[PDB]
């Protein structure tokens, strides 16, 4: 239980060493000419990868302080990845640059608060000019073009993504699953997606995604919090006797019930997953009722322990990831669900609250609008799985592009925001120092990509900055071209979130004046 | 079992090094512009915080003597926090300053007794002039203003705090809990509060922190000391049969009964919490009877144990038991049962003449009649509700302290304004003057630390405040010398007074130690 | 848990040292005059071998980075061996040469991308010239000559291999098995072969390769995936009551069913082997039904009610990681030619080329049986040794049929050097990579000469400046007609795999290893 504490510059230097190691490992994968990282496995052949995310996840340091810094940067870059589908490497390298420059300037006597205030000013200016620079993607032709670009010249993949988006909309739900047909195809089916994940890991998938994948499962709905084991044993035995998976949607599953669910999940292989009910307040119960009528079940909170297996709903397929749950095939009657929406539209014409209208319309969309499942084809199952990974990545990229537009790739989007930093109303010298830190960091992504391509980063950056507009550097072909015209693009959401999160983590490391670790 | 013993300044140096490490960790969080402390969690991500309390709670050194010093200062600061609601960081930094300067002067040959005499003298002078400087908070409008200030400019939180305090009084019972509604609201229900905690760890909610809370529980009250398993098994099985938690209130629960209650709770999962009966002497029996009639149960003292028929149990809708107090919320007792029990107390109030029995009789009557005000915080997200509950709890404790002892200018500027007060002290010898100078240097430390964490140099800021008017301090958030009382930069007088008193006490205790005995590792 | 990472040339040097050790061990076995490697065994006398493959498989280093490099090269060379049947040593030595030269040039300031672009250009040019150099083997006389040459001047082995290939075609199925007769003989029996392996290690034949080789086995076929123990217990009970092995061909066996199956064979020896159903989509179901009618079983109405009339019969089955052989069928012939009539009727109507290929492949599986080679002899030990030799000769002959033959002794690569002089290089680094490949091309012949006793520095120059150094004879002859040949597929795949692994090692800028 012993502790060791370091203070100020001494601790920040160790954490900076950790982030230096992490970003040195990650940055070699940047750009189309990214290099290879070899990661030793516990068993089998070593892993060869150019993926920044898997490289960052594999890094773990022995010394406590540098490990702490690396873990902080890893968490920030990872939550950047989960939002936009990319930008882990960009966030990591930007964070290292900003943290290094800030620690060097602070350790020489600069005021940390007046540096963070000014680093944030430059970041805000860069974000504003980046949003000004973004080219929106709204038309189906633009969507197909972006999807094909993210699919690396696959016209079929871009066309199927564009058709799915046209058929369910930009706000619609799109998922990709393994296809058993030689040709990829999409279809619109009923469905329901809410942003609540599993309470604790019950991965039956036990594979990529860290989710749960049942098929032909039961649905147990309860407004009451389920904590008594005696009130949940009958449901578990009813589900087990029919050998169907059970999905428990309650306000909260905890205590003895959660303990028994975990024990049975790992001892007798019980296929049960507990997920918190979506929403809050009275909207929780309305969403539960809507879900129950969609699945043809009933809600408890009926004594909750007298289940007769007619109380359960039916779920054809369910996918429960960390922060959201997808219910695919409902068991409720179409006449049942169409009448439930009638109540919602009746309440729409009466209630006029802005907050109440949004929730009711979202429930209406959940009941009426379905999900779009596109299945990826191929001549072999491993080809189908690899194409599934590629199509998922392209779909996330296209969703980000529709959300926030596109900007020139190769790090040139951040490079073209440099001239906007020369007109910031800075108060004192430390604010200018922070702005200069951000300005120096803006060149890091493009320079790293150039270095990975083999050419010198400084000269390429100088030519791009002192050259014609929209003239970037295509590393794969080794020539200065128009990036957006020739398709070298990145989603604006990716770069914006990466820069914002890197600045946030760097400022968090700059605010740390003491680090407490455990004596090994 | 071997022991190592160090003497005098040699051991005091190690203990001072420990408190130096602890206070250096804590002080970086001081002030509204405080810095960040990273605490490595054993499992999961590192913990990033600016709270001095959790920073001090997480420090535990390797060497025995410095760990002893750190633990002493931690305990003093922690018991400062429990009584007032804040001042852990202030107490820690003041304690380190006083201990450092006292050890330096004493080790140079000064008399420690005649230094502590004079440190305490100037502490008394500072406290007197602080009470003189304190502005009382008595009117409901002032209470609402203070609550809104403490809630960081949220009008509804201040209004709801002021409404609750108005509805139950300044001496009344207020607790904050999670709310399921989007809108925050307060209501007054029956209740009972007494300063007795759990006998042994029974924490159902470890996340809440050393609290044992559940709903719809049975209650058995025993005048006799429950120490036999045979007499408590029937009650336990009766409570288990109905799937209801059991609360044991008795003169003392110990021995094999306590051992079985702890072991079965840890292993099987018994929903049982044992709490010592409140009061002492003949009053303990009287308020045990009062609790029984308030909850609808009966007192055991043919009314022996192992004869419970579940009609001898009191019913409690909600119970919260913490380390230092217990809260029974919803009583199952009949309203007519309790409205005629208070008649007995009133009748005894005519007979009593001790002028102290009447105080306890009135306290029992108030406990029977006065309820508790529960206010549930609203929000659009459950996590938002939890965080707002924490914020409202902190604001409510600050407002309670302010009502108790008034308010003073914040940012440690009250201690800054008490500096000229001690220039006129009848010092006997030089050592008393030395102690007075030690405390004078200490008085500037909180404001200087807040300024340093803000970025600016505190040495110039303190002198600028001292040489200027008696109303302009330092914002340190806007970096402007402002009228802090009018602008809203205030601190409760109770918090600062207790912080200074406890820091002086722990420094004196650390400077009276002439021998430290540790165990050979 | 804790990780240690090295960057750039520092890590590439450790990996190069590891591959240096591995290739130094392997290269002493190259050529007809290859030297001897003694590998210590856990029990018994040490193993004395001149085989590059077994020496390479017996290398494991203590330091993390050099072991990582050695294992990368090992895996590349091994999967080179599994495709063509030879070239492990060739691939290893070429990989070491290319990696050494490339690392030395890169560490001195060259651009790795502009080196790999140009190394691959030279490799492609060498491949084109090698395919130009190859003499195709298509006639039965040439097939017999190649088989006899591979069999070390064994006329009978060459004759039997050539006859088997003639009787089942060059695309046919040929397997080698121990013979109980004094004289080796072949026969064509009904049989089936598809590229699907065991889901989990199930080897009852622990030695002589990783094989599941039992006889007189039941066969169940399931279109749906099998993951429930409730749906597989009846099959196991039925198979165990009759003391007959069970082969499971399904879409996928995983989860509780797979765990129960793998645990049972370990503890009681259930004699159960599972294998994923071959193919994809509709072709999977069609050929699953074809297999069912070939074995007499039925496809799976559920997995609970099975009995035994729904069980295909397999006389002999051999399952490796990449392919499954079902030797003896159980279905009635009137059932199998009736199914073939439907296949030819469907082929008579369809005109798509891609769909006709799978139809004819299914028809060949149904009708064209497999060919077995029983190897004769006077002792079981000699029969097994001859079986190993004949299997090697058959693999070499089939590779030669695939892509022709080229002069052996490393001369095939040596004769592509003069054709490397005409390459349009963009910059100096591409020329440097071309030079790396050019220097590496001499390495196999040089190693063979060095192991033969003579020094290859003069041997290579004599071979080039003239009109090939048979190492065993010691005289420069024309290797092709003399008999010193290698399959063109072997050298092509070895060169390509060595270049690929060397490029992969050159593109590595960071190695992440675990703290010991």
Residue numbers in the entry:
A (entry chain B): 26 to 326, 332 to 550
B (entry chain A): 26 to 326, 331 to 550
C (entry chain C): 26 to 325, 332 to 498, 502 to 550
Authors' own words:
As an alternative, we truncated the highly dynamic C-terminal GGM repeats of naïve EcHsp60 (Δ527–552), based on the crystallographic study of human mtHsp60. The resulting truncated protein, called naïve EcHsp60ΔC, was purified as a stable heptameric complex at both 4°C and RT. Importantly, the heptameric naïve EcHsp60ΔC showed similar ATPase activity to the WT naïve EcHsp607, indicating that the C-terminal truncation did not significantly affect the protein structure. The crystal structure of naïve EcHsp607 showed a typical heptameric, single-ring conformation in an asymmetric unit. Unlike the partially disordered equatorial domain of naïve EcHsp602, most regions of naïve EcHsp607 could be observed in the electron density maps, except for the N-terminal MIS and two C-terminal residues (residues 525–526). The β1/β16 strands form a strong interaction with the β2/β3 strands of the neighboring protomer and stabilize the heptameric complex. The thermal parameter distribution of the naïve EcHsp607 coordinate showed relatively low b-factor values in the equatorial domain compared with the apical and intermediate domains, suggesting that the equatorial domain is stabilized upon forming the heptameric conformation. The α4 helix of naïve EcHsp607 was found to be folded into the core region of the equatorial domain with α1, α5, α16, and α20, whereas in naïve EcHsp602, the α4 helix extended out from the equatorial domain and interacts with the neighboring subunit. In naïve EcHsp607, the ATP-binding motif, DGTTT, is located in the N-terminus of α4 helix and forms a pocket with G414 and D494.
